[PDB]
């Protein structure tokens, strides 16, 4: 119920939206650090994905933190120090000391505090980003009472963007971390653009006349404490109210009680049987794998050929063994038709095809509108028919500088007459004279006997509807075969035995990557089981077969006797014969429907209130 912030800037009101971001796990075993004069503990904590800094302040002890990789003037590091005058944020190669501290001196003659020692960094060589805030005055006084202010900070380092969420909440607890819920909001975004893996807290050092000795021993430590958390990426539900502030949150990985709210998308859970998931690990990284034939596809020649074939004989070229960069295809701003049936041009950079076929011919303006799947005319019926389930689209543009000469260009011949309707993706080259009446037409060209091929009149001053338009037809095929032609997307490294969502040759799913000993035929690419789910992956970058282990595989039934009624729930495992369970718990009972934990068993026989299965009934009693 702590560390919850706004993961997006989109305003939501009375809508529960599931988020997958770096969030603080519920009831985590966070580390506790204490600094009591009576313990100046300033360790270096690892920065895996994010650290939630929980600390309560009563005398302005904690000032800032040091962020970097090595902190030895060898890599780029981020400095955050909150002095008594201004706030200094710099990105330089600082040489940080072993135990950095800020020294504040106190005078017996006059009750005033003034920082005197600044021992944080030795020197800075090269600086990239520097931030200076407005000046302000802080009293920097010591309090003999209990804690008053609590400061919460969330650190995130994604794609070089440093987002810090802070919130001030007044508390009166002495030592224990306060409970309840808080909402955190961004205040500034820092484009540091560096890799940070280690960090250390920077406190304030107080000196006065009550601590005799040298500089290294003559000092006292203020009464302060802080806690260090970890941001594990887990799915969460956040309750966005009408004011835009999150008043409560729902976990999906702490307990089966929490995950029941996650599946139902509601904060209140009534009585019933719910199936959320088995023992489930939230995904942390993401992987994409595509074939690595980094070769440009040759459609730049088909779109720029020196000459184009006729309509009755359209040249078709197979495109394969290359990556198809469609960014130079739908962004040319020089074509005239891009109605793409089925798939969308925005998804052409993601999908993978078995092979790409590119037809080509030249057509007039009036017949460029009738090359859709369901259409009729003298072209779609006799010359070029697309299937009703056609994938891909035609591309046409004006051809007046080329293929347009005075006196008429009669080189092309379209099929004006034909005996029957044309089958889809069929090319007809036949010059036999078509007859109409019962008179024989054995090669004659008399009455009721016309040449099936009619020439075209292409003049530079002809009408726009009769201008010759160069038409190229891209067709995509999806067959049970490895995809030799894919989008220009790259491929990351391959991970194993970890619940990681994957992107294999255009197929996206979440699971655990495990080695498979099954022998896979070269014709097939994907393996499907009886349940019709993905089981085998070819992985064309390495050409090895991996078995997809589901992250959740067993059946879990959560016996929840309401939310306000009781906070105790029972977990029933269907595939477990009482381990791969959420928790061991107590009162483990094995029934015919499976293994039930968290619920007691009695030898009596009462009325069935909450059925379990196979005659087993459970109820909430005293």
């Amino acid at each position: 119920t702590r560390g919850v912030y706004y993961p997006d800037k989109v305003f939501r009101s009375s809508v529960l939206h599931s988020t997958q971001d770096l969030f603080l796990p519920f009831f985590s075993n966070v580390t506790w650090f204490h600094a009591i004069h009576v313990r100046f503990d300033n360790p270096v904590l690892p920065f895996n994905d994010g650290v939630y800094f929980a600390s309560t302040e009563k005398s302005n002890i904690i000032r800032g933190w040091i962020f970097g990789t090595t902190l030895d003037s060898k890599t780029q590091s981020l400095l955050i120090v909150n002095n008594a005058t201004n706030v200094v944020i710099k990105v330089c190669e600082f040489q940080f000391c072993n135990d950095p501290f800020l020294g504040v001196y106190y005078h017996k003659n006059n009750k005033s505090w003034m920082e005197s020692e600044f021992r944080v960094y030795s020197s800075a060589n090269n600086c990239t980003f520097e931030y200076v805030s407005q000046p302000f005055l802080m009293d920097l006084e010591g309090k003999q009472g209990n804690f008053k202010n609590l400061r919460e900070f969330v650190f995130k380092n994604i794609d070089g963007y440093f987002k810090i969420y802070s919130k001030h909440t007044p508390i009166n607890l002495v030592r224990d971390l306060p409970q309840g819920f808080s909402a955190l909001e961004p205040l500034v975004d820092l484009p540091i653009g560096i890799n940070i893996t280690r960090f250390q807290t920077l406190l304030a050092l107080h000196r006065s006349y009550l601590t005799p000795g040298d500089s290294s021993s003559g000092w006292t430590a203020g009464a302060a404490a802080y806690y260090v958390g970890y941001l594990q990426p887990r799915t969460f539900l956040l309750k966005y109210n009408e004011n835009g502030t999150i008043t409560d949150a729902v976990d999906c990985a702490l307990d089966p009680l929490s995950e029941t709210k996650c599946t139902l998308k509601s904060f209140t859970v009534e009585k019933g049987i719910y199936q959320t998931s088995n023992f489930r690990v939230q995904p942390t990284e993401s992987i994409v794998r595509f074939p690595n034939i980094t070769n440009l596809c040759p459609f730049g020649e088909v779109f720029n050929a020196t000459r184009f074939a006729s309509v009755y004989a359209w040249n078709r070229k197979r495109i394969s063994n290359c990556v198809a960069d469609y960014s130079v295809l739908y962004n040319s701003a020089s074509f005239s038709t891009f109605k793409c049936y089925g798939v969308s041009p925005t998804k052409l950079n993601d999908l993978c095809f078995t092979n790409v076929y590119a037809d080509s011919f030249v057509i007039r303006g009036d017949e460029v509108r009738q090359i859709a799947p369901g259409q009729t005319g003298k072209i779609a019926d006799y010359n070029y028919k697309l299937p009703d389930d056609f994938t891909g689209c035609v591309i046409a543009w004006n051809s007046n500088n080329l293929d347009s000469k005075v006196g008429g260009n009669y080189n092309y011949l379209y099929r004006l007459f034909r005996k029957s309707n044309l089958k889809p993706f069929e090319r007809d080259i036949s010059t036999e004279i078509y007859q109409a009446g019962s008179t024989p037409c054995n090669g004659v060209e008399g009455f009721n006997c016309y040449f099936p091929l009619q020439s075209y009149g292409f003049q530079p001053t002809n009408g726009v509807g009769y201008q010759p338009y160069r038409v190229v037809v891209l067709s995509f095929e999806l067959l049970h075969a490895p995809a030799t032609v894919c989008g220009p997307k790259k491929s990351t490294n391959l991970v194993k035995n970890k619940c990681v969502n994957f992107n294999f040759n255009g197929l996206t799913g979440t699971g655990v990557l495990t080695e498979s000993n099954k022998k896979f035929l070269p014709f097939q690419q994907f393996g499907r089981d009886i349940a019709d789910t993905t089981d085998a992956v070819r992985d064309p970058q390495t050409l090895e077969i991996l078995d997809i282990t589901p992250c959740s595989f067993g059946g879990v039934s959560v016996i929840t006797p309401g939310t306000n009624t009781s906070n105790q729930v029972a977990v029933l495992y269907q595939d477990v014969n009482c381990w791969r369970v959420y928790s061991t718990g107590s009162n483990v009972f094995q029934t015919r429907a499976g293994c039930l934990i968290g619920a007691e068993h009695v030898n009596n026989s009462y009325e069935c209130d909450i059925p379990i299965g196979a005659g087993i009934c459970a109820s909430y009693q005293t």
């Epitope: 960014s327 701003a333 038709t337 109605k339 969308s344 925005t346 509108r369 859709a372 046409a396």
Partner: antibody, heavy 120, light 110 residues
Framework: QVQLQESGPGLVKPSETLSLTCTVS??????????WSWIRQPPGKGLEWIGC???????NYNPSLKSRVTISVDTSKDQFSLKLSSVTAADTAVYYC????????????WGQGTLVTVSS | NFMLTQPHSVSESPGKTVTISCTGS????????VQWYQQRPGSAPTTVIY?????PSGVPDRFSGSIDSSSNSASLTISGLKTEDEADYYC?????????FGGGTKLTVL
């Protein structure tokens, strides 16, 4: 997600220079190869398309309002602006800036409607 | 010289269907797709129907779209009207180095 927030004064003198700056936050102007464009609409009338831009310097303009618009992309500030010259009294309209997922695709994400009025 | 023509104002009783037609002037309508927008007053227009009949997330199933190359017109059909459907409607298509729009059909309910 990503959103577009417009800026610039709403009071322009006739036959002067107009300067509107649409700032995009939560995303990258150069990355993705997305087309940024401008759309205006007179009050009570239909929408009018002004011009489109790429992440490079390539620009497309409407033929009716040609030789009056100059849109540029500032990748350092992650914003794209517009420059209108010789503003007439009929140019009083709500100006919009919209990202395009595709060159001839939908203006999927729109900015808030800013009011620009031509008055002396 | 391509422009889109639609009726200026089309109104219908609630509970029935209504058809809004967008017709091109010179060029064909079967190329470079079409887009439908709904502009609530005092707000930016939002996409309702894109592509032939594709619909973005957050748009009800009542908004149905179809094309007609023979009539050179694009049709948007709304069934089961509501108070929130009272807004300006626009049709958008693409031409050579320019994007075209329409006059704007003002739909009124009740």
């Amino acid at each position: 997600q990503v959103q577009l927030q417009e800026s610039g004064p709403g009071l322009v003198k006739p036959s002067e220079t107009l300067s509107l700056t649409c700032t995009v936050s939560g995303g990258s102007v150069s990355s993705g190869g997305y087309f940024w464009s401008w759309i205006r609409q007179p009050p009570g009338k239909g929408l009018e398309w002004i011009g489109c831009i790429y992440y490079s310097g390539s620009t497309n303009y409407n033929p009716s309002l040609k030789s009056r618009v100059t849109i540029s992309v500032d990748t350092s500030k992650d914003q794209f602006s517009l420059k209108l010259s010789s503003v007439t009294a009929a140019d009083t309209a709500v100006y919009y800036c919209a990202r395009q997922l595709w060159l001839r695709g939908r203006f999927d994400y729109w900015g808030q409607g800013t009011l620009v009025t031509v008055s002396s | 010289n391509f422009m889109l023509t639609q009726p200026h104002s089309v109104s219908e009783s609630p509970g029935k269907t209504v058809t809004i037609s967008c017709t091109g002037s010179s060029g064909s309508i079967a190329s470079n797709y079409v887009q439908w927008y709904q502009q609530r007053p005092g707000s930016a227009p939002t996409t309702v129907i894109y592509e032939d009949n594709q619909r973005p997330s957050g748009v009800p199933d009542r908004f149905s779209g179809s094309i007609d190359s023979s009539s050179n017109s694009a049709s948007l059909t709304i069934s089961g009207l509501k108070t929130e459907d009272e807004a300006d409607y626009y049709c958008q298509s693409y031409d050579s180095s320019n994007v075209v729009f329409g006059g704007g059909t003002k739909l009124t309910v009740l």
